[PDB]
């Protein structure tokens, strides 16, 4: 219908936070491999001079940016790991919603604001938020440990 059909990269840029919540795979994919699929595929064109005359001016432009894309990507996958949820896309926590971050209610958050819009209104607190989830894991990580000893 709408959630089971085509959309496109970054299509829900101006769609509500709730709307975008279906089209994650679209922008959760191609973060990496958006280019490694295309590069490997298009680069094996019948040229036979891939990296001829060793490396060149486009030589570093790519590798300086190839090596970025992955660590940039592995940075967000390191957060999923360190927050104990690499299920991605959507994941709940014990960290509760400090209304000091946003006093607003549920109804309008998901059905009126968009993520671009939202992440701005919440940009300043994200640092403090993100650090709360890490300390949420470690409480849980010690509580796990304590029980590993006695059983």
């Amino acid at each position, epitope marked *: 219908g709408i959630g089971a059909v085509f959309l496109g990269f970054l299509g829900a840029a101006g769609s*509500t936070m*709730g*709307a975008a919540s279906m089209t994650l795979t679209v922008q959760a994919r191609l973060l990496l491999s958006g280019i490694v699929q295309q590069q490997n595929n298009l680069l094996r064109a019948p040229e036979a001079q891939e990296r001829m005359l060793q490396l060149t001016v486009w030589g570093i432009k790519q590798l300086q940016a190839r090596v970025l894309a992955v660590e940039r990507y592995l940075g967000d996958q390191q957060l999923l790991g360190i927050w104990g949820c690499s299920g991605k896309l959507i994941c709940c926590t014990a960290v509760p919603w400090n209304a000091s971050w946003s006093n607003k209610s549920l*109804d*309008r958050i998901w*059905n*009126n604001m968009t993520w671009m*819009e939202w992440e701005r209104e919440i940009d300043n607190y994200t640092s403090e938020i993100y650090t709360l989830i890490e300390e949420s894991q470690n409480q849980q990580e010690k509580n796990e440990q304590e029980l590993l000893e006695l059983d």
Partner: nanobody
Amino acid sequence: QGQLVQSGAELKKPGASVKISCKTSGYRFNFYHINWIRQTAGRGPEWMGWISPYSGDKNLAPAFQDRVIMTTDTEVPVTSFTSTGAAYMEIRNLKFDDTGTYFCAKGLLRDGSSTWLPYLWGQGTLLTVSS
């Protein structure tokens, strides 16, 4: 966070035309509906109809479905998050009881149950109809 303005009191006669527009500020005109409500003293504040400035879909009141026709202009962005725009509602074959303080009203949400239901309200420019 925004504000709406309208067309001033346009005196007309029974059996004529009268046009009443609404212009926006401080919000994305396309993102929200535009409703229309008067203040007939005899009937009450009767709701006329709403229209989407994005999808062009309407839902007029069967009372004036054939009588009135709605229409909108393009949106003129101010910032990356705000804009300005125009919308209309003309009514022909007028009578006497088509009068009151006329309000335009922007919707509440972009999505949900109360999508079209108005939150922000216009000026209220009074209209009388006599020869």
